[model samples]
Target: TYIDPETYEDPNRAVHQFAKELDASCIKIERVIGAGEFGEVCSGRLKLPGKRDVAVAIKTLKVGYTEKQRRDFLCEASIMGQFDHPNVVHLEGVVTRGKPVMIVIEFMENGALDAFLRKHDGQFTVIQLVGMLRGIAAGMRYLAHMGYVHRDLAARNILVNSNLVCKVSDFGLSPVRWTAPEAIQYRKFTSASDVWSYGIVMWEVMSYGERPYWDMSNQDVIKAIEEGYRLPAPMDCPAGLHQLMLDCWQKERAERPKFEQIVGILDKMIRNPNSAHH
Candidate 1:
């Protein structure tokens, strides 16, 4: 019954379509978790008949939304619904047949990765950081195999579970700092450009979620990248990991490694922590 996001040419149609159409009565909104791109994101519980209650996160389409806004909000459901990876947020179903339409997903108690890391700065070992990075790359690798490119791959867009597992979550709306050169100039987006953003995410994880280019205006950051300026290695960042980051930011998209290769590299590092050092 799962609907694949890859099948739809007009994403707007996904507002009415779904993998599973859930009854609004089955979902109980608990608390506001955070603000989502299109609405209020909340933690909720789903109690399906004869089944144990399941913890879930709900993305609610706010009232007074325009038709296009509603369409846009529900569009995420279509893209997220098909993913079956542990490192990718799981879409439970959609509540389109009721008021305050919502997309139900697996609850991530640790919240967004960027802020989570910031709140607990200087607490993680390099090995721990590499584990998080590996989870994200594993998620992206799955997406790549599915012929999907996550245009947004920043730490902020990744969610964290209770045990510190990283899962790629919400899509973005043209984030300047995480975007690659061709995507900025020509609106070109591909798995290769996604790799560039992956590099930025790697920087975020290593630095405990520091802003990619501290204090640089968006326009300035854009110009700086074009002028050959790259973000420096984070403090105590391993050289091999930093080298991987640079590999991702190659100005020429084709030179960037694919997600599968990225996954392999991270696996090697995790298999032997000493290898992560260079």
Candidate 2:
């Protein structure tokens, strides 16, 4: 049931050891929508109980996957099934009894937040963008309450639905640029490190999906952060929002605000439009 650290691969374990086994026949794959961490993601339909139908995103395991690969693929479902929030992507089910093992999830019509924002840059008012950040923070807060660490939280990891509701996605851990310094140096991941990543996400939203650190090499990012350098505020970023970002990037992890506090801060901004100025 555990992946070995030495080889990082195992042949004997199956994905169902920790997740529920779903009937493969109920999921009908339609067309390739996008690429996933493991393989191709597809648009599909799921036949639920009592003749119900739902649009879904199906993540297929590549043909001829190793046991380790299958384990890694299903790992997302395990993490996702534990979370139930309006701001979090819901796990539909997983199909393991068929040729292509698939993890079915609620389809996000708008796709990733970063690409969506970039596609319509500057179209949304600051109020609209702050609302999206607030939803993501609420999701992170839920994860923290459930005693789980996302390890990776960024604009690219957040998904937007048809109604512009932002839900946290890409539960995978360890994105070098989005990662916090303590997690990079000591291999530690906690809600505090998540707070650091959230700060970077705030920058991304403010800048309309701009890459954090903007073309800096990963090695340079590491060195600069260690030397007490921080990313400057994005052009046109509100002062209050930028201040919150700095609080999140504090060298001492303890100095970073909790997700609950972040949610409150964004809520205050949303409730008081003038609060964003200073």
Candidate 3:
């Protein structure tokens, strides 16, 4: 899952050119799944001599970034390397040569969690919702226990498979605890920060993957966050879940519950789907 982005012979970390060196005769790139300024992702199938096949997603990052961004990218690779959990995206391997950096991972056919939820409509019944939350909470618990902060924990970063299993992905912004020895305070995150993100994710799930502010601009969203503007409670949202969301997003981070507590709450909700106050 973690591959060393190849650096040039002279020691320059040019990620752009390094990506070209990741060639494979056995694997054929099928189509472009997604693309961005930083890089692009391609869906591909790996062919084996025995006729067995493995589907994969290839992510490539752009180069020409400053040293700090490179460090961040490498940090992502490192964290992915250390993580091997069922609820986490499976990192197959890495390809590197000179400049561009590429990460290989398992391809989820069902697409992103948010996208899937949106396709199904904004309201998944209590049982489906709790099942999804259970998986997400389990993944969060594993990451927290492993000392990794999934800085960008949102519905978009979660993927679902044909079996409806949830797996967490995208570590570019994740802060693995204590990796930076000289850095103080562990990447501006606590268990509370994750809880806040988790609350947003719940909102996404309940809203059928609608963003917090579907009609607002980026600046507006930032301002809203700064002003402590939480997402409005959906008409069908359970009172307990709504209250938990509010608690998670409280200004004081320490007031939020731990992962174990969150897991417990979700478990309770799953056990008594009708217990959520109207």
Candidate 4:
């Protein structure tokens, strides 16, 4: 289901062939929830084959989708179907047979990680926040094991559910600021590239949603990194945790710890509790 844009010859035709097609008649649109790549995301009721109905989040294709947009839109669904993990958002299915082609997924009530953290700044305990990070690292470990590179990894792409469970959501889209330098220069995406983004995501969580490089232009951020400038630890951030952030932000990709290693480190910290802030 992972269609490499480079290898995919006919964008429009390939999407239909690769993505599972859902009956459009079974979906009932509710309210606009947010915006996505091709169009707005909506809350809807999906009637299943057994006459069951469930609330769902629907992503629709914009009117007059270019062949490229269609391919890009469906790519997310294709990528999502390959992973089955609690920390990864699940794809219900996709609708491509009719007008307003859509991708249906489980609704994440708390929205993006950065926005959610911003909304409840200073409210979560360090251990609670570390638990969120642990979940994300576990998800990345699964993705890496599957040989899938999540070209984009950021707080904005992660979703928080009602119970405060964090799930990695967006795929194949990078917020330039959170992206790795090699990705910026040569478009190289690998497990290590994702680790680089995870470092930025850690910074966001520790800072309670502060933007990386604070007010600096993307060009400035890139230039600064090339000159060996790394972000300082957030005020009141745990010393041990900040050290892990530094480890993730290592300039050479090989020097960065693998996601499995990251998960182990967080898991150990969680077990010790005080070691997280040591």
Residue 98 CA error for candidate 4 (Å)? 2.2
| Each model's lDDT | 0.84, 0.82, 0.68, 0.82
In angstroms, how far off is 24's CA in candidate 4?
1.8
lDDT of 2: 0.82
lDDT of 3 by residue, 169-259 (tens): 8776332211111112345565568877888887888778886767777666656666777777775778887777777777667787777
lDDT tens per residue, model 2, 1-278 = 22322243321223344345667877889989888878999988998888679989998988888766876777676667657799999888776655578888899988889999999898888788889999999999988887778887889889899988999987642277899998998999899999999999998888989988888899989999999888777776788988899999998999999999999999999889678876
How many clashes in each structure? 0, 0, 10, 0
Please give, for residues 171-241, the per-residue lDDT of candidate 1 as tens digits. Answer: 42217999999998898989899899999999999999899999999999988998989888899888888
lDDT score of residue 47 within candidate 3: 59
1 versus 2: better TM-score goes to: 1
Candidate 1 stretches with Cα past 4 Å from truth are 1-17, 172-174
Which number leads on TM-score? 1
**Candidate 1 structure lDDT:** 0.84
Assess the local accuracy of residue 114 in candidate 2 as a C-alpha lDDT between 0 and 100: 92
TM-score for all models, in order of appearance: 0.92, 0.91, 0.76, 0.91
Question: In candidate 4, which residue pairs clash?
Answer: none
Q: Write the per-residue lDDT of candidate 4 for residues 1-278, one digit (tens) a residue.
A: 33454365643554455456778888888899788768998988888777669778888888898766776777777667667899999888887655678888888888889999999998888888888999999998988887788887899888888888899888642167888888889988899999999989988987889899999999999899999888988876778888898898888889999999999888888788778767
